[PDB]
Design a protein around this nucleic acid. Structure first.
Lengths: 107, 299, 299, 299, 111, 106, 85
DNA sequence: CATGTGGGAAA
RNA sequence: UUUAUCACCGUGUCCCCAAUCUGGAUAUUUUGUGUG
């Protein structure tokens, strides 16, 4: 679904990194407010680190080299082909799309 | 013999002189051309300021001077602008006033003054811009106050290009007998200059003349040059057919041509034939460009 | 034999030549073309002013002169504009009338100036506009409170383009009594044009030499041309069919073209064959106006 | 007498001074040059801090000192900055201003320090970079679980090159009132500096001795050199022209030729002919500096 | 879009308030009883909003406006309609530039 | 209802621009007749130049961008979005109201 | 021709997997995670390391294709293999 | 004449 | 509801301007265990 794929992969990446750093399954946070505070702090730290990392480099080959390597998209078993074939304007636009998606997720 | 054109080159070096600004900690560099690549520029008024600073340095009396004061950029003017004064850099400027006294200090000179006898143009990096950047970390935080800067430290970025660049300039022989020594001092400043770059302590390079390839003519301020060289500097090929037969076949004359550093190239067989028409036996740009002053000027 | 059609273009160079106005601190430029892109133009009256200035440069009497005086834009108008004015009034310009005094200025001349022998049209950038700008300056204040200008130190912008543009022109050959003395000055002036810009202190730009395609026919003002070159500037593709059948196949004859600077293109084979029809020999455009002006004129 | 242009001296050895950060656990080095290859660089500000430390170890009263404290990169600024400071601030530095308190620091000097007497430039590896790398690190884990570090034990990468690099710099004379006592120590520090790299526990690198071709004349800050050696350190690509010249005819006028570690190269006969006019009698760069510092100064 | 117009206004005012709160640790909750605090509060608001307005008005272009908007501005939190609003944005942007100019310029304090 | 807010916008623009440019207000103007004369003539000049500037460039983008000037006076709190949408769509009656409001101040 | 890269990557990964009921699922999940070590080694390459329907034609043609846009190939093995796990 | 909000995916 | 008719003639948007002043990505680390 094009942009929805970018949104999903960004959200999955941030969740996967948060799970690798700290215990997953946020529903266990439950009532203890300090757990919410520390969870939000770690979330925003990871998100703004990625935000800076993608912001400082948005120029053609380096951008994609950092984007594909450090992010884990969905499978897109056969629908990915169209996503790959139009890669030039795809990158030219998904720089802004990825920046917007990353900026969307702050506490 | 009433007009002078010229173009000059510089040695390759890392770039400097950021102009634009951005919150992203990146000091951007001005760019113009879109032919599939990008180039860097240096605006001419900055070089005009450098020329004013150098005429300050050499012993010429002038009425404009820059002062370090309250954070608003300011320059005092003292005496009123006047054509008949030792000042020539202070001569160029024109400024209006709501009052403008009583008919411009009672009919003494005239306020709106011509640009100058000197005209210039922007520079072009003649090398495509590259996305390389340099990364540095600036800590600003003190443990004993002493009127510290912002509380939190930061990490910043710059960018730099290893290139050399050129720019043209020209002047007219309308009024020269009135300012012989002024034109001499201006030419001496042009022969070698300093600054023109924002970053002194970092990325230092000066616009040493690498080649001068033009002379005067009574052609009434008209030219033929495209004002652009190749990467290696041996541009004369595009003018080779223009210079080899300067004497005949309705070709531009021999008197219009010069040589700077490119003349010192290892091949010298054709230098013999070009010497038969043009005066280009000069290897050091400073001596040649000083000798040009006597021929161009009345004295 | 009685008509002359031609188009003139220029070398590429960064050119601002600001004309518009805006409080937005960006000196806008004029755009007229609508194909999804913007093209810069130069209005013809500026070229007319430059032509008047160059006629002033050579010995040519005139009745209109620009004076530098009080802030209102003014002209010193001197004598009555008579049709028998040697250079300016006869060649172009008009004699306006509000009251037309008494008995038609003592029954002299005619206040209806209908003919403007120099016909001119605007130029087209033939290069799409780019939204690039230059952050070239910040206004700064005075510190000694002498002739104090605007209170604060403002900031603004400017934009430039790297472009080369062409314009058409035409004139009808009718008179031969007074024109031959003055027409020769016009042709010489056209070969060399100097000015046609806002301020040459920055981005001084000149468009003197490039390929030219003059055409003289007894066709009573008729042109097969389109008044447009390519991005590279090889407009001559349309004449490829025209040149082949000069002798036969019911198509225009051998004396049907003139040459310019573009002849110095690398290929030579068809230039040898095209020589059999047209006068494609002049490598220097300035030399072209020396000869074909004679043929078009009486001598 | 008032200007000093100098060159650089280094030895080949494995590299250090990483700046980049790759998530793939590699310490990437900085590359800026684009001629089909990569080159290693070191920012001049690193060398500026190294010179500050070199002045620190010698007896020099300063206001800036580095401290190891809370994880923010902090710098101990001591008392309020002084422009007549005995070590650095006069020599090179700045006095900050966020609001600049009241009445210009209670009527004390001038806050912004425009001059940075030490004027240097970026370094260049002058040896093409290779993608050679080595992973010599297998990080560890805590076994007794007392104040443990990161739980996992990962694998990373490091890259170094066999290279020797140079960094052009120059300076001019400003005011001999306090110039000697600080500048003489500064020249000694230049002749012998340390660090300018984070990594010294591994890849210990120093660039103290090598050839120097420094150059000083009162030509008003003019540079004819290119600021670049060849692969094997033979600057002779210019020594044929600006060194063989004997300031007598048709040659550059010079009298301050200097040598370094290159004077002892295999050939010796031409050293005799250069000794007829040059001063390249120094095998030690230290001895050369000890004399040329006094020569450049008043005594 | 009128919904996206409200989004633009809300994100502009939120960015202004959040940047002021973070940069100069100042809260409007302390308004009552401290009129001098009101002067420096309005001064800081003037500075930040004037800088933002001049920066956004400085240049007009597709790529420049788009990437400045996505980089220097932090949009609000919404679940899905961002895809629709963004995709509608990318065909036409001039109206969005005018709307964000209106929202940002409406933030000037009175007198 | 938007006609009144447009008129108030124009009036506030004129008064604020004059006060910012040449530090003058109504009371000190009431002070002495010469100050009425000076302030009044300067107000005529500024409103006249604004009217001359706005009388041209009659289309969507040009009128919108010239509306970008004047710093969007007294737009205040955006309690109502209908002005942002419907009035931007109409883009014709707004020009007439703005011209009438500017001409009303002389 | 991106689908060709996807197919060859998937087929070769399954070939290595075959070379050497929740038990079946976890076995496949853990083994595919193991094979990822080979890919991080391959994606550490910069220019020069490690070099189905037909064999004769590809060497005659695809050999030229490999050497001109090798910069493109870096995304193929990285993007496609990661998409699997 | 002024500030507000969450959570998954595959041979 | 018929019949005929050039909106015509001229015009530099022009004159001055610097994105300026300072800034060590630093801190640690067995590719280790084997074999006709």
């Amino acid at each position: 679904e094009y942009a929805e794929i970018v949104y999903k992969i960004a959200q999955g990446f941030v969740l996967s990194k948060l799970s690798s750093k700290h215990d997953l399954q946020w529903s266990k946070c439950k009532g203890n407010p300090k757990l919410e505070r520390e969870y939000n702090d770690k979330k925003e730290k990871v998100v703004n680190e990625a935000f800076l990392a993608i912001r400082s480099r948005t120029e053609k080959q380096a951008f994609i080299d950092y984007f594909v390597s450090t992010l884990y998209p969905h499978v897109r078993q056969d629908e990915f082909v169209d996503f790959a074939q139009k890669l030039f304007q795809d990158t030219d636009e998904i720089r802004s799309l990825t920046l917007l998606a990353l900026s969307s997720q702050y506490p | 013999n009433l007009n002078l054109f010229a173009t000059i080159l510089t040695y390759p070096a890392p770039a400097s002189n950021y102009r634009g600004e951005s919150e992203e900690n990146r000091s951007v560099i001005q760019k113009i051309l879109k032919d599939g690549q990008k180039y860097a520029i240096i605006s001419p008024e900055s070089m005009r300021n450098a020329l004013r600073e150098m005429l300050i340095e050499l012993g010429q009396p002038n009425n404009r001077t820059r002062l370090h004061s309250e954070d608003q950029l300011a320059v005092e003017f003292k005496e009123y602008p006047n054509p008949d004064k030792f000042a020539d850099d202070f001569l160029f400027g024109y400024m209006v006033a709501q009052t403008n006294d009583a008919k411009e200090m009672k009919k003494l000179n005239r306020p709106a003054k011509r640009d100058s006898i000197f005209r210039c143009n922007m520079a072009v990096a003649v090398n495509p811009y590259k996305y390389d950047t340099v990364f540095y970390q600036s800590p600003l935080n003190a443990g004993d106050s002493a009127w510290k800067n912002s509380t939190s430290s930061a990490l910043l970025h710059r960018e730099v290009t290893h290139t050399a660049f050129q720019y043209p300039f020209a002047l007219a022989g309308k009024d020269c007998a009135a300012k012989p020594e002024w034109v001499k001092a201006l030419l001496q400043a042009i022969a070698e200059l300093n600054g023109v770059a924002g970053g002194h302590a970092r990325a230092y390079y000066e616009f040493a003349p690498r080649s001068v390839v033009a002379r005067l003519t009574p052609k009434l301020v008209a030219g033929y040059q495209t004002y652009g060289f190749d990467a290696e500097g041996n541009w004369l090929e595009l003018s080779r057919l223009t210079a080899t037969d300067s004497d005949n076949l309705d070709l531009p004359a021999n008197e219009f041509w010069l040589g700077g550093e490119l003349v010192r190239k290892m091949d010298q067989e054709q230098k013999a034939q070009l010497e038969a028409m043009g005066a280009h036996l000069y290897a050091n740009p400073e001596k040649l460009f000083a000798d040009l002053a006597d021929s161009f000027l009345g004295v």
